[PDB]
Structures are given as C-alpha cells and as structure tokens.
C-alpha cells in the first residue's frame, strides 16, 4: 500500500534551514516535550486502591473452581470423565462409585491448582453445568497441599460464591 517513513530533506534554503538548526542549537522540542507531561500531570489519574475500591469485570469470568448443585439439594455433577479428557493441563481427576443405592454420582474429585491454565473448557464440556467458573480472586496459601483442591468438599464450599454464580449463569443461557 505504501505510506513512507522518510521525510526526504525537510530543509532546503534559508528559512527552512534555520528553524531545523534552532532546535539543535538550543532545545525547543525538548521544552515542547516537557509540555506534554506538564498537562498530563494536571488531569485526574485512574487509580483503584484494592482494599476499598474494586476494578471492572464481566458477567462471564474464570477464577477459582467451584461445583454447583440443584435448588432442591442433590449434587449436580453426574460423573462422566468428560471434563477429565478435555482438560489440557490434566488438573481434574475423577473416580466414580455408586452412591448407597440407585444413584451413581462421584467419589474422588480433585482439581489441581498447581496445574490448571484456566480455559472454561470444563465449564463448556459439562452437559449438566456442574463446574461453573465464579468471579474469584482471593486464593493464597503457605503450601501446595493447602492450594490443590481436595475430594469436592472445598469445591462444595463454593456456596459463598454460588449465589453470584446463579446470577452470572442467567446472563449465560442463550449466550450474551
């Protein structure tokens, strides 16, 4: 398409030479460059202090994993190994056994945070919508053991975020 970066001799004779020499003799353009930051100082900065103010987000955002449940009790996860095979990090492990009598829903359910690159693939591959990614930021531990999620339990403890998840999924069915 061509645009050209080269100026091809801005100075020609007398008048065009002197002003190109004036900027190199003293400064001028450095004083003009000084004025750029000068007005930039006066205008209000966009700063957010975290313990009081919070930054912008979205209805669909992936953070720490938490598995959802039905409104009338019952664990929504059905045990498929579907999310296990899609997982590109292989962070999720699943071994399933029959629950007492009749029902067949999970036994071993570990999601590694040492692994997991956060895709929302396990959210997408799930037909029952068990793992739904909630707006999470707060996670800090002393050990790997405290960081990697155990057999559901702490994932089921996502009830504190499941109220937000139920609100966020209402913006998810028939996507946006």
Q: Annotation-wise, does 122 bind a ligand?
A: yes
Q: Annotation-wise, does 83 bind a ligand?
A: yes
Minimum distance from residue 100 beta carbon to ligand SF4 (Å): 19
Residue placing its CB nearer to another protein in the complex, 24 or 145: 145
For residues 122 and 86, the answer to whether their CB atoms sit within 8 Å is: yes
Residue placing its CB nearer to ligand SF4 in the complex, 19 or 95: 95
Minimum distance from residue 14 beta carbon to another protein (Å): 25
For residues 39 and 129, the answer to whether their CB atoms sit within 8 Å is: no
Residue placing its CB nearer to ligand SF4 in the complex, 121 or 164: 121
Footprint of ligand SF4 on this chain (CB under 6 A)? Answer: 77-80, 82-83, 86-89, 91-92, 94, 111, 116-122, 125-126, 128, 130-131
Minimum distance from residue 75 beta carbon to ligand SF4 (Å): 9
For residues 92 and 111, the answer to whether their CB atoms sit within 8 Å is: yes
Alpha helices in 61-149 (DSSP H): 82-86, 121-125, 144-147
CA-closest candidate to residue 58, choices 166, 176, 157:
176
Cβ neighbors of 132 (< 8 A, separation 6 or more) are 66, 67, 68, 123, 165, 168, 169
CA-closest candidate to residue 125, choices 85, 89, 174:
85
For residues 109 and 153, the answer to whether their CB atoms sit within 8 Å is: no
Q: Annotation-wise, does 161 bind a ligand?
A: no
Distances (CA, A) of 14 to 11, 17, 160: 8, 5, 76
Binding partner at 131 among ligand SF4, another protein, none, C-beta below 5 to 8 Å by kind: ligand SF4
Minimum distance from residue 21 beta carbon to ligand SF4 (Å): 50
Q: Annotation-wise, does 77 bind a ligand?
A: yes
Binding partner at 92 among ligand SF4, another protein, none, C-beta below 5 to 8 Å by kind: ligand SF4
Task: Give binding residues for [4Fe-4S] cluster as ranges.
Answer: 77, 80, 83, 87, 116, 119, 122, 126
């Amino acid at each position: 398409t061509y645009k050209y970066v080269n100026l091809r001799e801005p100075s020609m004779d007398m008048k065009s030479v002197t002003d190109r020499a004036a900027q190199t003799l003293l400064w001028t353009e450095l004083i003009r460059g000084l004025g750029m930051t000068l007005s930039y100082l006066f205008r209000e900065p966009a700063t957010i202090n975290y313990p009081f103010e919070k930054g912008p987000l979205s209805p669909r955002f992936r953070g720490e994993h938490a598995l959802r449940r039905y409104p009338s009790g019952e664990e929504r996860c059905i045990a498929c190994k579907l999310c296990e095979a899609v997982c590109p990090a292989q962070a999720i492990t699943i071994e399933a056994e029959p629950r007492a009598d009749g029902s067949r829903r999970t036994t071993r359910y570990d999601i590694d945070m040492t692994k997991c690159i956060y895709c929302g693939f396990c959210q997408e591959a799930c037909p029952v919508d068990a793992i739904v990614e909630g707006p999470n930021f707060e996670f800090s531990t002393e050990t790997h053991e405290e960081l990697l999620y155990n057999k559901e339990k702490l994932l089921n403890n996502g009830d504190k975020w499941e109220a937000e998840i139920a609100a966020n999924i209402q913006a998810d069915y028939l996507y946006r």
